[PDB]
RNA sequence: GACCCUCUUAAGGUAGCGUAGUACCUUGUCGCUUAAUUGGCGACUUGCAUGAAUGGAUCAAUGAGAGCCCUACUGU
RNA sequence: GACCCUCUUAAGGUAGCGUAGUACCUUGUCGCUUAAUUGGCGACUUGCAUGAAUGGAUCAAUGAGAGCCCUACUGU
């Protein structure tokens, strides 16, 4: 039940409708300030906090309030004698409902100076109090601290008679959530611009537990984050499928940040194994891209997690039969197909993402250094300056060629000779790794061909054209583009690239003997752009 | 160029015709598949987007008036191009 | 100057002296509830809040007042008319000095079931408010919340004669943030036990902007846990060193787990690079230690960092000489290495850490994965049981090898083989490992295997003795022990490794085909003791 | 077994005779010598942990009486066990 | 009063400290300390003429060292 | 009133919902709504005799459908 309702809020939306409604509810209204004024002006009748403490008013708008001796009232138990009777003393109220928001503090910057003396003035101190009184009231005072929640309330009340104990926890629990917000603004602005040394919030609530960790006695529980974002793991449905885990969750998002890199357009899809996502693909209709991918990886692959960039069709749908998926995402589905799926198999964990072909919404990383969180700016920008120095140069198409690797092997793990070309109509995919292993060079000595070539020899083996092997691959491998992470160490190893006959390397510039990888570039016949962009994933 | 796309009107679609009649998920499938066949569809005697559909499985060729029998709702479907790709392989082959 | 004192600390440290420095500059003392009798006892003349704020107070422990127009007075300049007016009113004092911290939240669990009632009502209320108020004016009024910085403000007062912006401002930003904290907790608790979310508020302190990322442009920032617990790689020495970048604090991470994983032990390091297990051994000198841990590397070596448990000297920075290394984690360091380190090659980035090994200190690891963040316990687990399925058991000897591995293993990125085999009978070494490679036999066949011969080459001629490689292997080519991972796959497998002799395999429990697995090693007689522990490390 | 080590006294060591003169590292490096030269060796002899410094450089076996040269303050010197161990791998050679 | 040039007849003060036991102007300006202080301390500092083993800054403990202040004490 | 057994002559009610248009006892107990309510709504529920296409729960919009309440209105 409510009686008597305290209704200072900064954030006036929506108030003027729960205050008809408590108003009709006979509910008196006590308020002062912005809301009173609105509310004696939309036709709802307020009495004003003057007519209960002994305190005037001054700067209407935040502070002007408090309740010392007396918040001791609503405080707990607005109805605990002890607690009760302090709040309604002398023409005080026994007020059982209490809203307050707080207007988010904002620094800005203006024309001739950061703005602090007013910009700070404005930190509600009357506001935040009454919130964290009336919020300790687990039981009798119903804090309403959010505006999204007149709703909720009103119509339990209309109903019910008395908001739940239930209701009055949530309610109570994000108010204080709320002060604390609040103060962690007040903290973080002002560690970054009255002294120097800043200090970075974190953004983890309604929390989860999992299965367990890498081994059975190695708990781990997924945090969510309040943030709307955009696509994220913390809005995806498990259509059906295990409860995911600890390497789900990582690989997944690794997933998705590969195909999130490409940006919409052209058909994509990828894979991905112990956090390597190794097999992206674009081309046309999914089908071939995502089979190419399971060209690319034909062996560990079983039990990996697609990361398509649209809806799912029974074409591959049967492709993927038999070839076990941890987690299959996807922005969407098609009924049959997942019905289809979701019967035949028992393991994949189908976990489309409603809607994840937009912008992702965020921009920083917290790499966890045991007491260390860093800030990286999430960009993915494939080149600072395209300049191609050694004689031979790229055609356009040979750009795209190139290109195609930033797209992955920063979506990627790197140290990675990613050997992105051609193998659909006019659509490159990524054909060889490195699997980040010690020297630059040791990717190229044990991957490169080691790949390009295993993929090379499914297709041969299976189609077996005229081309006898060599030739056959030579078909592309003359052709090739590998733009391997950043600036390629030196010149041999270029050269062993030249060997398996990729006259088409790609090296950003700048390591040993800049010089050295130019002329070796002409000599052999590399064609190497000088990008700049080194694509590792920090 | 196009309507007022409001900060809520990205839904409906062409479905917008029915109000809040017959459940989301049909005025999805429903708009889903207007937007698919008012898509511009290429002429394969022309070569441009000028093909739409003049009754249930008949399209028609604005430029040229090449017109020829389809799907229902698409001009192309992906059964009959896989039976032309298939003849064009073996005809690429012999 | 700052002639009032209002002095209601939660946490009675400290107060007496601080109240009487005060008491001798003068000061009237104005506190109430708690410190009003301590002082009031220990000598220190103390007026009692009751005539100051128009209404007296309250239930004292906690609530005492909470007035609008006297938080007001304090709260900002109390020298600018509309602010100052909330420090005179009607005998209203315009006190300047404030230090009220706030008893940490705490939910006791109670032998009868939680005492959530108590908890809940022992929330201090007032104490922030003050607080909050004070703690705005960065101008005139000071706060001083936590109670160890009592000194700091008493000596600038004592000399100096009024406080310093400089001061006020860093008094302020921590009292805000204390206020925080305890709204935090707030939240947390109450949201865990109340309701059943986990949020996840965390801080980081101490920013340090640092070079990058990725990108030559990916500023980010070194943001400090102010973790007290133990090895910290913020609380470190840079004995001399540009600021280190992402990639370097990560190793840093990498190695100093490895490290601390082997228990320190028996003189130990842990050779890092490229975040990948590059070097751990044991010896009874860093001289052998750093060599036993170097040797199995002939490969990415040079750009690696070293993380000891004793000391770095220039015996064995002979050798080092000239082998790049990117930083030094010694917790003991020798003057003459230091110098000749600090001219020789600058690269050195000296980053000892003051004497590092202890017990981690901390419960908790983190992983954001973008759009949320898993909280995957601290656990040591080395093994479960030990017991070999397969008849033949280890010998004392190959148990020590198996117990190494563990360790390393452990603390070594999977999906590998690791192959640590003995260097000098008691101090064992890496011999192997297997960066994330498809699966565990293609890990076998291109790590393991092949990078213990290359090794085993190395090694003997180097040092050449009489034993010719070939019969030098031979040796000890079964005693090799590798735990990888866990349950390598099947047996044909265990059995390749046996084509490379290697005959000492140590394998948790619960493989593809354990039964046969079993089998197997049991007729070849390879020591396959199952140890129990899914590593599984990533 | 040990003294009353304190929440503050594992720092000065046996250096605690010195006070607060002498500045902390030279303190340090006095303490670490006394904790290294005071450990207990283990005699060549006998096998057992009973060597003690009884001058500058003479160490003697409480046990068995070998009384030897070595270190002025630990009784075996990395130098020396280098020079052994050489002469140890040339005899094992031949 | 930053920044290209100079005058550069080798170079043109880095970290620090600063009216100093170094500051002529000088009892420099401001704040605390006093009723009032060429004082002491703190900050600022246009440094006549500070500055890194001609060692710079700083410093717990120690001092029949040199200043200023509080308390107690008193024929000072 | 959880848990091993039963009685199990196939099995022994999962998700939900619950005094229901289903609840005999019954005007069940409590809270709002009234001065007062075999009423309505909400919660609890020991379900005489709920429960998953004998389809369960829920539901925006729609309804000459069925109840209860507020306001306005009035010879009801």
Redesign the pocket.
């Known amino acids: ?1 409510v009686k008597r309702a305290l209704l200072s809020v900064s954030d006036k939306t929506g108030i003027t409708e729960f205050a008809r409604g408590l108003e ?1 509810l ?1 509910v008196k209204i006590i308020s002062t300030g912005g809301t009173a004024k609105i509310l004696r002006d939309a036709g709802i009748e307020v009495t004003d906090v003057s007519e209960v403490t002994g305190y005037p008013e001054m700067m209407g708008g935040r502070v002007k309030t408090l309740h010392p001796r007396i918040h001791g009232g609503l405080l707990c138990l607005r109805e605990s004698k002890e607690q009760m009777e302090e709040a309604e003393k002398e023409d005080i109220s026994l007020i059982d409902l209490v809203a307050v928001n707080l207007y988010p503090f904002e620094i800005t910057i203006s024309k001739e100076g950061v703005e602090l003396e007013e910009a700070i003035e404005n930190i509600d101190i009357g506001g935040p109090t009454l919130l964290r009184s009336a919020a300790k009231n687990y039981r009798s005072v119903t804090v309403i601290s959010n505006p999204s929640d007149y709703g909720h309330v009103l119509k339990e009340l209309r ?4 908001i ?1 104990d239930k209701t009055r926890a949530n309610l109570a629990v994000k108010a204080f959530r709320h002060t604390a917000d609040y103060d962690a603004a007040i903290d973080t602005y002002l560690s970054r611009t009255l002294l120097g040394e800043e200090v970075l919030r974190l953004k983890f609530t309604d929390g989860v537990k999992l299965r367990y960790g890498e081994n059975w006695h190695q708990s781990a529980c997924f945090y969510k984050d309040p943030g709307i974002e955009g696509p994220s793991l913390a809005k995806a449905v498990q259509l059906h499928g295990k409860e995911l885990s600890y390497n789900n969750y990582v690989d997944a998002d690794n997933a998705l940040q590969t195909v999130k890199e490409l940006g919409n357009a052209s058909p994509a899809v990828a894979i991905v194994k112990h956090n390597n996502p190794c097999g992206l693909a674009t081309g046309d209709t999914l089908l071939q891209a995502l089979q190419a991918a399971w060209d690319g990886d034909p062996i560990s692959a079983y039990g990996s997690i697609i990361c398509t960039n649209e809806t799912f069709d029974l074409e591959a749908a049967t492709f993927l039969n038999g070839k076990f998926i941890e987690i299959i995402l996807a922005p969407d589905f098609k009924p049959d197909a997942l019905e289809y799926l979701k019967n035949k198999s028992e393991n994949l964990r189908l976990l489309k993402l409603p809607e994840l072909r937009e912008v992702f919404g965020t921009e920083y990383t917290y790499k966890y250094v045991i007491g260390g969180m860093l800030k990286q700016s999430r960009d993915i920008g494939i080149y600072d300056k395209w300049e191609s120095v050694t004689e031979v140069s790229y055609p356009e198409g040979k750009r795209t060629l190139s290109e195609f690797c930033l797209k992955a092997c920063k979506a990627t793990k790197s140290n990675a000779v990613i050997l992105a070309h051609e193998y659909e109509p006019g659509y490159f995919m990524v054909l060889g790794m490195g699997a980040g292993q010690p020297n630059r060079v040791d990717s190229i000595r044990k991957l490169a061909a080691t790949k390009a070539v295993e993929n090379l020899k499914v297709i041969y083996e299976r189609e077996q054209p005229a081309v006898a092997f060599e030739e056959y691959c030579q078909k592309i491998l003359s052709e090739c583009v590998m733009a391997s992470d950043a600036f390629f160490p030196f010149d041999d190893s270029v050269v062993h690239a030249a060997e398996n006959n990729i006259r088409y390397i790609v090296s950003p510039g700048g390591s040993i003997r800049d010089n050295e990888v130019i002329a070796t570039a002409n000599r052999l016949g590399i064609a190497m752009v000088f990008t700049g962009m080194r694509h590792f994933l920090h | 160029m196009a309507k007022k796309f409001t900060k809520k009107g990205r839904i409906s679609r062409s479905a917008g015709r029915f ?3 017959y459940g989301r998920k049909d005025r999805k499938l429903v708009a889903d598949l207007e937007e698919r066949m008012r898509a511009p569809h290429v002429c394969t005697k022309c070569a441009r987007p000028t093909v739409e559909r003049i009754g249930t499985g008949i399209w028609k060729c604005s430029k040229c008036g090449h017109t020829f029998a389809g799907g229902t709702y698409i001009p192309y479907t992906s059964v009959g191009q896989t039976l032309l790709r298939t003849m064009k392989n073996i005809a690429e082959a012999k």
Request: proline share 9%; no cysteine; charged share 10%.
């Open positions: 039940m009709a006979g109903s019910s008679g008395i739940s | 109000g809040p009649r």
